[PDB]
From a paper:
[name] homologs are conserved across all domains of life and are essential components of MMR. Once a lesion has been identified and isolated by the MutS mismatch-recognition complex, MutLα is recruited and, via its C-terminal endonuclease activity, generates nicks in the heteroduplex 3′ and 5′ to the mismatch that facilitate excision and replicative repair.
Crystals of the hMLH1 NTD formed in space group P64 with one molecule in the asymmetric unit. The crystallized hMLH1 construct contained residues 1–340 of the full-length protein. The ATPase domain (residues 25–207) contains the noncanonical, ATPase Bergerat fold, the core of which is composed of a four-stranded, antiparallel β-sheet (β1–β3 and β5) and three α-helices (αB–αD). In addition to the similarity observed in the overall structure between hLN40 and the MutL structure, we also observed the presence of an hLN40 crystallographic dimer similar to that observed in the E. coli MutL–Mg–ADP complex. However, in contrast to the prokaryotic structure, the hLN40 ATP-binding loop is partially disordered, possibly owing to crystal packing. Gly98 and Gly101 are positioned adjacent to the pyrophos­phate moiety of the bound ADP, permitting the close approach of ADP to the N-terminus of helix αD. Residues 301–320 in the hLN40 QTK loop are disordered; however, we can infer from MutL structures that Lys311 within the PTK motif should act as the conserved basic, γ-phosphate-sensing residue.
Residue numbers in the entry:
A (entry chain A), B (entry chain A): 3 to 85, 98 to 300, 320 to 336
The structure:
């Protein structure tokens, strides 16, 4: 038994593998990029996809853009214009894809384009055509981690997941226009419009049969420091699988705990196989609160 | 609406906060350090604690030690002598505590002592007294993150958690001697001995009433690529709360899924309130396997 010798991991490998762990699949890259479009005050967001996002993801917005002088560092880890940690999403994407950014600010004379590998600027940004806002292009996702590339689903399931994410951000963000299409196709698979209510976007993404059966919900509680709004299906609507959109502080989230609560409430009113449609937006800042929601929904179902 | 300006996070803050997130509490620092003692082929491990591990944790082993020339980088991130990622545990601890290491290799002429802040060597290592192996001393845990220091439990609950961890590693590692005491006390609260069987260490840590009621278990399956051994309580033993030790590849782990399976099996044999004692060691390399364990245990309870 002798002592080992300590070496350093190659963190070009470490950083690639961790970035794979964060991103996971094209829908998730797209989720991060959309959130950036919304943070940059965009009112029009367009998504274009080739091969389920494995070949190309392109997202164009009309938001505030990235200043020319900041393109040097925008994809580095822990660089952010905002107050896990801020500044990891584009850095991560850039470690497992070829990223190009085309962007213009109101105060810039023209748009600039820059390309990145592993978080680093490849060359000085170059002026190009383009209007107010930002187009990010993400190519060959996981070209450098074979195991995750093969561990992804077929192109049409991955496209399916992108639709789910974008359609879901579009219900939460009524008034902002969203679209998703496959590259080289002219007709969008999802398209919402700048003057749409929350209910119109539910009708558009989820169909007239759900939109006709919605109950509006809201409750605030200053003592429990939370607010909630959204829409739920009344006791007359039933499908084979529960469609549950959940947003907590404007991020889309999954929650086995709360979907359980609400299912128990609905179990008493809906048929044996069948399930509800749920859209809830919770505003919280940093337990018994999940009683008030179960209570509030049951109250609304009884009414 | 104008464009932001991108700045860099201070990663002295980032690194401190993430390290808090990993470590969480003294029992967990101790878990990481013990595992290092075992990796370094230690047969005698001594733990000493002041104030539940908030003031001092000291762990002495007789393992292979750290070479003098490697003390410079041992607490840096991603430095390891081994093949999330390797090399994060001591780096993390050193970002939220004052770490001192005293260590000797068989080939070194004497032990060397070094002190670290934020992963960096404070001064050149200095020769000192000490035998084969390594003593790590971890002081003032979370002195630099007030919110986690107050979010820790009272000193005696945290000490309680250290006992749990060490007692549990000691059942898995029969033949290796472990002890834990409070600083300045002469009698250990936990002590296992170099010639002890697994059953002796269960008797010692968990008492004669459990050790008298154990069924040995083992199953291998080449097709499902797993092995399992351990000990369980037979249908005659019952306590108010389920004591379940689980090791997968020699790390202690919690598992709501498998503890559920086994509880369902035991529910049929044990009284209404009461629960079993379980020690299982699973060897796996990188679903239907949880059926074989539920099956194998029921089989052993029926027999
Ligand atoms: N669509 C966009 N429009 C304007 N700025 C963007 C856009 N996407 C990214 N950015 C800029 O790049 C930075 C890094 O983004 P990201 O890596 O997601 O970290 P974060 O959003 O936490 O700051 C943002 O703070 C922002 O300044
Ligand atoms: N008790 C110990 N005895 C010998 N070497 C140790 C001990 N603790 C830590 N080390 C050394 O420091 C390195 C860093 O430990 P750690 O930060 O836990 O990362 P890892 O265990 O993944 O290598 C180990 O690879 C090992 O060489
Ligand atoms: Mg972002
Ligand atoms: Mg370790």
């Amino acid at each position: 038994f002798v002592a080992g010798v300590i070496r350093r991991l190659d963190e070009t490998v470490v950083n690639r593998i961790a970035a794979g762990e964060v991103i996971q699949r094209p829908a998730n890259a797209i989720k991060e990029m959309i959130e950036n479009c919304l943070d940059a005050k965009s009112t029009s967001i367009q998504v274009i996809v080739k091969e389920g996002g494995l070949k190309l993801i392109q997202i164009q917005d009309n938001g505030t853009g990235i200043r020319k002088e900041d393109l040097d560092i925008v994809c580095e880890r822990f660089t952010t214009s905002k107050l896990g940690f801020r500044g990891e999403a584009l850095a991560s994407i850039s470690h497992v894809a070829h990223v190009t950014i085309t962007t213009k600010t109101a105060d810039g004379k023209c748009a600039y384009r820059a390309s990145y590998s592993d978080g680093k600027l490849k060359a000085p940004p170059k002026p190009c055509a383009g209007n107010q806002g930002t187009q990010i292009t993400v190519e060959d996702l996981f070209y450098n981690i074979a195991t995750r590339r093969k561990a992804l689903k077929n192109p049409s399931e991955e496209y399916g997941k992108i639709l789910e994410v974008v359609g879901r951000y579009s219900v939460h963000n009524a008034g902002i226009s969203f679209s998703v299409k496959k590259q080289g196709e002219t007709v969008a698979d999802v398209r919402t419009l700048p003057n749409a209510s929350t209910v119109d976007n539910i009708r558009s993404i989820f169909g007239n049969a759900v939109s006709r059966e919605l109950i509006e919900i809201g409750c605030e509680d200053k003592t429990l420091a939370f607010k909630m709004n959204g829409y739920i299906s009344n006791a007359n609507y039933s499908v084979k699988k529960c469609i549950f959109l959940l947003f907590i502080n404007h991020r889309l989230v999954e929650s086995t705990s709360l979907r359980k609560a609400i299912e128990t409430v609905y179990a008493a009113y809906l048929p044996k196989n069948t399930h509800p449609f749920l859209y809830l937006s919770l505003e919280i800042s940093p337990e018994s609160i999940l009683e008030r929601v179960q209570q509030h929904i049951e109250s609304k179902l009884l009414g």
